[PDB]
Amino acid sequence: MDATALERDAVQFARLAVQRDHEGRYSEAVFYYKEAAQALIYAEMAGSSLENIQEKITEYLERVQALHSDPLKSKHQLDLERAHFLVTQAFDEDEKENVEDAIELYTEAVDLCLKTSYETADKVLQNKLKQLARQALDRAEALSEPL
């Protein structure tokens, strides 16, 4: 197998990988990108005169990393635990009729729920945060201005 036969295989592999890439069939496109790069790697070992070969190897392997697709979920798990904690504390002051602290704690929960919902695109998370903020604001206002 010489460079000329390896370069031609590399062209048929990449042509098939890009059309599967186009079709969103990303998992078989990884396979043919990996076959393409490997054909080129052997081709450079065989003395390939192709002038952009190293670039094209690197192109295809990067496309495999791009298609392969965290610490933000960690942050949001803790933010929710805090909102839950704040509301729980407020629940404590609420039942003990420590009205002023209950109001402060309910409204700090509000700020945390609205602020966290600007840090996400998950609309289901956004609404759950806004429903807890709405509920806590309602109760704070109930403690603050009894009708």
């Binding site: 890009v18 186009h22 929710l80 839950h84």
Partner: peptide, 25 residues
């Protein structure tokens, strides 16, 4: 000729809500 790549690339609110529900009473 070698083609190029495409341009193309919790807690439980419910127990809170339940407790809020009882508080409106």
């Amino acid at each position: 000729v070698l083609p190029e790549l495409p341009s193309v690339p919790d807690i439980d609110f419910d127990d809170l809500s339940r407790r809020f529900e009882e508080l409106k009473k």
